[PDB]
Design a protein around this nucleic acid. Structure first.
Length: 88
DNA sequence: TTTTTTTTTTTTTTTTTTTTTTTTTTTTTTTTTTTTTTTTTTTTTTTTTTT
């Protein structure tokens, strides 16, 4: 089988297509997440000059990336809400 | 030739200045936080247009 993804831009907004049918960003995203690519992570693209700036980042940004890939960023609000409650 | 007198060089002493070194104090750029504003993007209703 063969899949045809698309994305057309209108005005300011952008619309996504699956199998030549208009879809919303979230479901398209979820399909990609099934395929195995975390677009917000940005761990597999390297532009003109960033191959150096892969190494010299401040460690926090690298931790951010490693937290992003690992599906442990969604559990943030849960964490610090529990934190504030228990410290209170 | 020898004796007497003058002048230049060398070297030591001293005094003033300079340099050094640390220490303590001070005040400043640097670094982080928070906010927060802007701008871009988004949505949804309205408007326009088409069959």
């Amino acid at each position: 089988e063969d899949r045809t993804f698309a994305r057309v831009i209108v005005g300011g907004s952008s619309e996504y297509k699956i199998n030549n049918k208009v879809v919303q960003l979230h479901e398209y995203s979820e399909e990609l997440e099934k395929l195995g690519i975390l677009i917000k992570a940005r761990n597999f693209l390297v532009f003109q000059g960033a191959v150096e700036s892969i190494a010299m980042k401040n460690p926090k940004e690298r931790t951010a990336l490693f937290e992003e890939i690992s599906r442990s960023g969604e559990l943030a609000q849960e964490y610090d809400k529990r934190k504030k409650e228990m410290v209170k």
